[PDB]
Amino acid sequence: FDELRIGLATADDIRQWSHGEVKKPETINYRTLKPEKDGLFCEKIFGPTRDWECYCGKYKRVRFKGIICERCGVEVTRAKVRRERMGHIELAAPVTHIWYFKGVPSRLGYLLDLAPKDLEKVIYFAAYMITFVDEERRTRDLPSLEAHVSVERQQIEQRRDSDLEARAKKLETDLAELEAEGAKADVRRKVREGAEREMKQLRDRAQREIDRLDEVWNRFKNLKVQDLEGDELLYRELRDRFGTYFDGSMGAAALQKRLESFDLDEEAERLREIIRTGKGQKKTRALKRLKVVSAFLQTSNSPKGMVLDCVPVIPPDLRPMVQLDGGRFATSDLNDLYRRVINRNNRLKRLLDLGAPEIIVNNEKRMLQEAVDALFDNGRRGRPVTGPGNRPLKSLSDMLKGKQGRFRQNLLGKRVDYSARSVIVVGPQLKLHQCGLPKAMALELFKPFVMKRLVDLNHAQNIKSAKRMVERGRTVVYDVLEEVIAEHPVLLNRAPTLHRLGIQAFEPQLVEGKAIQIHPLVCTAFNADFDGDQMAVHLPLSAEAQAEARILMLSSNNILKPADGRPVTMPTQDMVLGLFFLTTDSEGRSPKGEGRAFGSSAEAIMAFDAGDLTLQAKIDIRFPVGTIPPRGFEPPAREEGEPEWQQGDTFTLKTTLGRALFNELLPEDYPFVDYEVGKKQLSEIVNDLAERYPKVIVAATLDNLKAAGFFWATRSGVTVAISDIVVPDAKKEIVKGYEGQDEKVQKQYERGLITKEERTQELIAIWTKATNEVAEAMNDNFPKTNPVSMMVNSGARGNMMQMRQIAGMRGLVSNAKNETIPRPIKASFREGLSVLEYFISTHGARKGLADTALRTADSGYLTRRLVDVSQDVIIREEDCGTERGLKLPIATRDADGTLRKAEDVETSVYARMLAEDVVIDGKVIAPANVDLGDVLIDALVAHGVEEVKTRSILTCESQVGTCAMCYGRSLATGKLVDIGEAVGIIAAQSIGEPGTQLTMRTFHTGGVAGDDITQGLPRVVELFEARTPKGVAPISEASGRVRIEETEKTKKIVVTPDDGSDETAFPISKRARLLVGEGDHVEVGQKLTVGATNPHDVLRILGQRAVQVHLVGEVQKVYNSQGVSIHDKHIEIIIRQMLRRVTIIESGDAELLPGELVERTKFETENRRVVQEGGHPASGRPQLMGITKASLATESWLSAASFQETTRVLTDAAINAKSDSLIGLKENVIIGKLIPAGTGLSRYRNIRVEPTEEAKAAM
DNA sequence: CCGGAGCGTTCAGCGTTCGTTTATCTCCCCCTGGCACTGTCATCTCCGTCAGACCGTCGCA
DNA sequence: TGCGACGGTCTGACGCTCTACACAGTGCCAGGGGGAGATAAACGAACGCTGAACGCTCCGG
Ligand SMILES: [Mg+2]
Ligand SMILES: [Zn+2]
Ligand SMILES: [Zn+2]
């Protein structure tokens, strides 16, 4: 389990694994249903089908286990041994493996210098091959064979001359006799014409016999190894004419005979020689050939296994034939493929037994080879073997691949026991850490524990009686159930589970109904909505699992979302509206009892219950001792003649009753919050509470906030009648004026003075102006009292666009294929659309639905790719010895006379760590190795700093992984990241979580294609794939003079760098936009055409820091366009995992291949060991590569096998004979060992616990 | 005042009879072998992916 | 050889579950070797049968 090897399995290994020969094709008997002898499903080879029974019906008893039956040879043992015992099929003629031959040429490898079409010709029995030639023996006796050929030519010419003389005599004789007989007037001309026709035909066959002799001579003269011969007649006449000189064969046996004598070390030698000198695509050919051949040199596995003689068989359980109801049978397609191979092998053996024609034997060997190929890969070549006539049979590989393969459907993700699922309901009566399971769910989940406690409580005599009562379901079972499930957490989980908070451990609690009762305060972190969403409940089982549920997983410890550090367990739908109504100012609502002193909040509550004081009214309310005053009230303390402090003393405040209640919700140590709460300030309050109070106190305060928010939202005066939604009264006249001027334009267009396109453009412009103006009128119309504004201005639920298109006009709405109708929807949803206006609304609606479906699909795909590329990076050191960092800006866009901090400081500089101390006047403002929060950043920007050096992960160098300090504080705990936290998966999920939340598509292309770059999720995936964007913006290599060259066929730009640097020319199309000055000043910074720069050349000509900044800035500017906030360290992790590979050149002294994928640490180690040897180091360039290519090119082939290309990497590992170290997480999920992240580390599992001496002395 | 016949238990003679095997006689099964006018090249997939690579191929320059 | 483009090749293409299902057109008989399965006999052992025999308490003239 330390190491998991792979390689080519030669026939010796197959025979070692095998336990017999599957000689016969049949599987089971047709009446007794017993497995056959020495055939498929054989009990002698694979093992018995029952337990400790044998085939011949004897030896049914268990006592004499491990013996061999004399009658039938079946070993008596368990029935599960048929899951692990394999045999083999002995093939009469060798066949090739379809994985290596007929694949990617990087894995075919050109090990023999043959074209793939030549292989198709040779091993599919359509063209011959010469396997061996006695070249030195052929060249030794050249004068003798030349003399024999000369003798043959001489006798050919002699017999031609004799035949010519005889034909001349015959022609003269017949001409003389037909001119002397005089049978006809011109019969001599006819016989002469016939004679000359005979002349030309016999001369033709003479030149033809000469031609075949010449062609066989020049064919034999240039015969060598690796020679093919398509024509069977030509090879036959070489065999007949010339003997024991060249050896050839037919089919895959030719490859075996070539490979047994194939000399490959000198092949690598001369191939290195042609690597050293040459030019062109020959370099690439020899490069791939040397990268494949050198695998067989260093490794000890012989290359014999590419062509095979034996075929191992799957054990019979894994290709079962199971009995069903009604007598029907169901078998796997592997049994059918094995049956086909066995039938054809038996028929080939039968043909080899007797004397058979070569065409029939060759066709039999071809169909055998094709059947073996179909067994290894059904559908790789040609029409797949269908079978029933509907679908192709699934081969071995066809279930090692894809969504139906073992890697992705049964190894990474598995079904589980002790799990349950039902719909969800909201329960406000629960705490933060409680969930309500039904009775049936809790009984079926906790059934074995219930039986154990029932036997312990002796309600049942033994286990069977306990099970009988549980199945019957008596009330004592429910009582002991309620006694059991407490102090036993369960894992709740939603199916999408987009991010880390999709699994949260609650404490179960018995409730009635058939639905899981769930705290509303946490349902937004699940993305849960109570509309039939079904949540599965998984049960942690051992002590370790429920301990990790209690400590790591509890719902009262997951306040802060790891995506941005913002609180996520304070939802907004209903409680925020209640607190808004509780704490808002009295505007538009009649304030009763406005401006009267109150002794305490109790007297105010009594007055409010009486009815003479409204909830929001500016009153002077005195507060008892211990209440902390507001942040703004401490300096404006009540004026004092003697020295006094208002910090712990009583005070009077000008605040409403509702704010006093709200500060009764918050803890006593919190300062009196004295403003409109809404949502954003509530998020800030919850963030401050989480940052400055322990977890249990924060859970209690949010539970109080939930309860009071619901209580006051019931009485908040929100409701939606149709009078509450109000249309602007000015909308009628605004629309009337705009349609009047539209009518004026329409009669203006009717005269043809303007085109249709210009009219459409100006019409959509003026109608956009109209909808913006009526939106402004709508904002100016509504008061603060109506509930729609009260639930949209409080951050509760809704945006201003929705209220704009319910009250005001719906505005402009798109057509099919992304254009705009000149006529907008002038009717509001309160007024109600007309027929066709509603039709054009449906145009946009269905496109939006299809867009969000495809968007969530591609978001899941990007999330998976990010998880693969960004995994196996884990915090593994406490601190580095480094001091280098990143120059992240802190103060930007300062005005005249003032300094302003950066706008995106909250996602970039926050939650990081300083690389070194900062000084402005010789004194440190912020110490090194501390987090950067609000107060410290405010102090720095007040002192007058412009940029800071943050110790980020891109500059982190370490012996293994990354350290905690260089990564920065974790955004999910609010503290420093613990050693072992799997930061890579958290980063990948945080990038992939708002993929469905982007909801972006290009509104209009402007009538031209290609002018607009990719937007939204396609832009993000194009950035992370390191691909060249669709809008390419070239960058000048050096500063110099740049001018345009407007060639008519294709535009052209030319930049001439100064200082004697070489001219570089960039090709640009005849497209509309180019922003560079002709004969103007240019440098490396700017871009010749506005567009997305290709980041490959950015890295090439600017540096690693510049390309890191560019990538981070681009993805963050995509994400910030929608409102989703992702911290930049999550991107920086993927970018660091992205630039790790380095491309090397001129590696003539570093003794490895130049111009491939080389790891950075390995390249540095090679440089160190070659400068230790004295040789000059090889050059190297960093290579920005995509997430997919970096995921495939990994050390552990199990992780790459679990990814997309699972056939290429398996063949690659088999050829390279690479064994993977099990450092990683996919390769530890598959095996079932503990993952090396978090609790699974070595430094945590190696603890020994013992009580102290005074502890055992006490008891 | 010990004798006797009757009664309880305990083993060896021969006499049949179960306990356990064997080859013989119907019945069915199963694999190989046999058909003697002539009748000598079928079969129908596969389209409104799909997106952009990734690649070697391959003819033109 | 460098060029494009033409081409084949190849891969996935968010997620469980309330739900969930099954699947079709062209020969025939005789002769012969195995093995299960019924028949009656047969080798071997013990299971009954013959009362007889060892030996006591026994009512007894
Ligand atoms: Mg839902
Ligand atoms: Zn047996
Ligand atoms: Zn570090």
Coordinates of N, CA and C in Angstrom, one line a residue, chain A residues 684-781:
Chain A
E684 N -22.4 43.1 8.9 CA -21.3 43.6 9.6 C -21.4 43.3 11.1
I685 N -22.6 43.4 11.7 CA -22.7 43.0 13.1 C -22.4 41.6 13.4
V686 N -22.9 40.7 12.5 CA -22.6 39.3 12.7 C -21.2 39.0 12.5
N687 N -20.5 39.6 11.5 CA -19.1 39.5 11.3 C -18.3 39.9 12.5
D688 N -18.7 41.0 13.1 CA -18.0 41.5 14.3 C -18.2 40.6 15.5
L689 N -19.4 40.0 15.6 CA -19.7 39.1 16.7 C -18.9 37.8 16.5
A690 N -18.8 37.3 15.3 CA -18.0 36.1 15.1 C -16.5 36.4 15.3
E691 N -16.0 37.6 14.9 CA -14.6 37.9 15.1 C -14.3 38.1 16.6
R692 N -15.2 38.6 17.4 CA -14.9 39.0 18.8 C -15.6 38.3 19.9
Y693 N -16.3 37.1 19.6 CA -16.9 36.4 20.6 C -16.8 34.9 20.3
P694 N -16.8 34.1 21.4 CA -16.7 32.6 21.2 C -17.9 32.1 20.4
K695 N -17.7 30.8 19.9 CA -18.7 30.2 19.0 C -20.1 30.1 19.7
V696 N -20.1 29.6 20.9 CA -21.4 29.4 21.6 C -22.2 30.7 21.8
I697 N -21.5 31.8 22.1 CA -22.1 33.1 22.3 C -22.6 33.6 20.9
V698 N -21.9 33.4 19.8 CA -22.3 33.8 18.5 C -23.6 33.0 18.1
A699 N -23.6 31.7 18.4 CA -24.7 30.9 18.1 C -26.0 31.4 18.9
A700 N -25.8 31.7 20.1 CA -26.9 32.2 20.9 C -27.4 33.5 20.4
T701 N -26.5 34.4 20.0 CA -27.0 35.7 19.6 C -27.7 35.6 18.2
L702 N -27.2 34.8 17.3 CA -27.9 34.6 16.1 C -29.3 33.9 16.3
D703 N -29.3 33.0 17.3 CA -30.6 32.4 17.6 C -31.6 33.4 18.1
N704 N -31.1 34.3 19.0 CA -32.0 35.4 19.5 C -32.4 36.3 18.4
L705 N -31.5 36.6 17.5 CA -31.8 37.5 16.3 C -32.9 36.8 15.4
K706 N -32.7 35.5 15.2 CA -33.7 34.8 14.4 C -35.1 34.9 15.1
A707 N -35.2 34.6 16.4 CA -36.5 34.5 17.1 C -37.1 35.9 17.1
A708 N -36.4 36.9 17.4 CA -37.0 38.3 17.4 C -37.3 38.8 16.0
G709 N -36.5 38.4 15.0 CA -36.8 38.8 13.7 C -38.1 38.2 13.2
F710 N -38.3 36.9 13.4 CA -39.5 36.3 13.1 C -40.7 36.9 13.8
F711 N -40.5 37.2 15.1 CA -41.6 37.8 16.0 C -42.0 39.1 15.5
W712 N -41.0 40.0 15.1 CA -41.4 41.3 14.7 C -41.7 41.4 13.2
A713 N -41.3 40.4 12.4 CA -41.7 40.3 11.0 C -43.2 39.8 10.9
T714 N -43.7 39.1 11.9 CA -45.1 38.8 11.9 C -45.9 40.1 12.0
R715 N -45.5 41.0 12.9 CA -46.2 42.2 13.2 C -45.6 43.4 12.4
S716 N -44.8 43.2 11.4 CA -44.1 44.3 10.7 C -44.9 45.1 9.8
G717 N -46.1 44.6 9.5 CA -46.9 45.3 8.5 C -46.5 45.2 7.1
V718 N -45.9 44.0 6.8 CA -45.7 43.7 5.4 C -46.8 42.8 4.9
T719 N -47.2 43.0 3.7 CA -48.2 42.2 3.0 C -48.2 42.7 1.5
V720 N -48.7 41.9 0.6 CA -48.8 42.3 -0.8 C -50.2 42.2 -1.2
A721 N -51.0 43.3 -1.1 CA -52.2 43.5 -1.9 C -51.8 44.2 -3.2
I722 N -52.7 44.4 -4.1 CA -52.3 45.1 -5.3 C -52.3 46.6 -5.2
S723 N -52.9 47.1 -4.1 CA -52.7 48.5 -3.8 C -51.3 48.9 -3.3
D724 N -50.6 47.9 -2.7 CA -49.3 48.2 -2.2 C -48.3 48.4 -3.4
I725 N -48.5 47.6 -4.4 CA -47.7 47.8 -5.6 C -48.4 49.0 -6.4
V726 N -47.6 50.1 -6.6 CA -48.1 51.3 -7.1 C -47.3 51.6 -8.4
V727 N -48.1 51.9 -9.5 CA -47.4 52.4 -10.7 C -47.2 53.9 -10.6
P728 N -46.2 54.5 -11.2 CA -46.0 55.9 -11.2 C -47.1 56.6 -12.1
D729 N -47.7 57.6 -11.5 CA -48.8 58.3 -12.3 C -48.2 59.1 -13.5
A730 N -46.9 59.4 -13.4 CA -46.3 60.1 -14.5 C -45.9 59.2 -15.7
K731 N -46.0 57.9 -15.5 CA -45.6 57.0 -16.6 C -46.5 57.1 -17.8
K732 N -47.8 57.4 -17.5 CA -48.8 57.6 -18.6 C -48.3 58.7 -19.6
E733 N -48.0 59.9 -19.0 CA -47.6 61.0 -19.8 C -46.2 60.9 -20.4
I734 N -45.3 60.2 -19.7 CA -44.0 59.9 -20.2 C -44.1 59.0 -21.4
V735 N -44.8 57.9 -21.3 CA -45.0 57.0 -22.4 C -45.7 57.7 -23.6
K736 N -46.7 58.6 -23.3 CA -47.4 59.3 -24.3 C -46.5 60.2 -25.1
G737 N -45.6 61.0 -24.4 CA -44.7 61.8 -25.1 C -43.7 61.0 -26.0
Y738 N -43.2 59.9 -25.4 CA -42.2 59.1 -26.2 C -42.9 58.4 -27.3
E739 N -44.1 58.0 -27.2 CA -44.7 57.4 -28.4 C -45.1 58.4 -29.4
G740 N -45.4 59.7 -29.0 CA -45.6 60.8 -29.9 C -44.4 61.1 -30.8
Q741 N -43.3 61.2 -30.1 CA -42.0 61.4 -30.9 C -41.6 60.1 -31.7
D742 N -42.0 59.0 -31.2 CA -41.8 57.7 -32.0 C -42.7 57.7 -33.2
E743 N -43.9 58.2 -33.1 CA -44.8 58.3 -34.3 C -44.2 59.4 -35.3
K744 N -43.7 60.5 -34.8 CA -43.0 61.5 -35.6 C -41.9 60.8 -36.4
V745 N -41.1 60.0 -35.7 CA -40.0 59.3 -36.4 C -40.5 58.3 -37.4
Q746 N -41.6 57.6 -37.1 CA -42.1 56.6 -38.0 C -42.6 57.3 -39.3
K747 N -43.3 58.4 -39.2 CA -43.7 59.1 -40.4 C -42.4 59.7 -41.1
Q748 N -41.4 60.0 -40.3 CA -40.1 60.5 -40.9 C -39.5 59.3 -41.7
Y749 N -39.5 58.1 -41.1 CA -39.0 57.0 -41.8 C -39.8 56.5 -43.0
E750 N -41.1 56.8 -43.0 CA -41.9 56.4 -44.1 C -41.6 57.1 -45.4
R751 N -40.9 58.2 -45.4 CA -40.4 58.9 -46.6 C -39.1 58.4 -47.1
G752 N -38.5 57.5 -46.4 CA -37.2 56.9 -46.8 C -36.0 57.8 -46.5
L753 N -36.2 58.8 -45.7 CA -35.1 59.7 -45.4 C -34.0 59.1 -44.5
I754 N -34.4 58.0 -43.8 CA -33.5 57.3 -42.9 C -33.7 55.8 -43.1
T755 N -32.6 55.1 -42.9 CA -32.6 53.6 -43.1 C -33.3 52.9 -41.9
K756 N -33.6 51.6 -42.1 CA -34.3 50.9 -41.1 C -33.3 50.6 -39.9
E757 N -32.0 50.4 -40.2 CA -31.1 50.1 -39.2 C -30.8 51.3 -38.3
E758 N -30.6 52.4 -38.9 CA -30.4 53.6 -38.1 C -31.6 54.0 -37.2
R759 N -32.8 53.8 -37.8 CA -34.0 54.0 -37.1 C -34.1 53.1 -35.9
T760 N -33.8 51.8 -36.1 CA -33.8 50.8 -35.0 C -32.8 51.2 -33.9
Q761 N -31.6 51.6 -34.3 CA -30.6 52.0 -33.3 C -31.1 53.2 -32.5
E762 N -31.5 54.2 -33.1 CA -32.0 55.4 -32.4 C -33.2 55.1 -31.6
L763 N -34.1 54.2 -32.1 CA -35.3 53.9 -31.3 C -35.0 53.1 -30.1
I764 N -34.1 52.1 -30.1 CA -33.8 51.4 -28.9 C -33.0 52.3 -28.0
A765 N -32.2 53.3 -28.5 CA -31.6 54.2 -27.6 C -32.6 55.1 -26.8
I766 N -33.6 55.6 -27.6 CA -34.5 56.5 -26.9 C -35.5 55.7 -26.0
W767 N -35.8 54.5 -26.3 CA -36.6 53.7 -25.5 C -35.9 53.2 -24.2
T768 N -34.5 53.0 -24.3 CA -33.7 52.8 -23.1 C -33.7 54.0 -22.2
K769 N -33.6 55.2 -22.9 CA -33.8 56.4 -22.1 C -35.1 56.5 -21.4
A770 N -36.2 56.1 -22.1 CA -37.5 56.2 -21.5 C -37.7 55.2 -20.4
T771 N -37.1 54.0 -20.5 CA -37.3 53.1 -19.3 C -36.4 53.5 -18.2
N772 N -35.2 54.1 -18.4 CA -34.5 54.6 -17.3 C -35.2 55.8 -16.6
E773 N -35.8 56.6 -17.4 CA -36.5 57.8 -16.9 C -37.7 57.4 -16.1
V774 N -38.5 56.4 -16.5 CA -39.6 56.0 -15.8 C -39.2 55.1 -14.6
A775 N -38.1 54.5 -14.6 CA -37.5 53.8 -13.4 C -37.2 54.9 -12.4
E776 N -36.6 56.0 -12.8 CA -36.3 57.1 -11.8 C -37.6 57.7 -11.3
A777 N -38.6 57.8 -12.1 CA -39.9 58.3 -11.6 C -40.5 57.3 -10.6
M778 N -40.4 56.0 -10.9 CA -40.8 55.0 -9.9 C -40.1 55.1 -8.6
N779 N -38.8 55.3 -8.6 CA -38.0 55.5 -7.4 C -38.5 56.7 -6.7
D780 N -38.8 57.8 -7.4 CA -39.3 59.0 -6.8 C -40.8 58.8 -6.3
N781 N -41.5 57.8 -6.7 CA -42.9 57.7 -6.4 C -43.2 57.0 -5.0

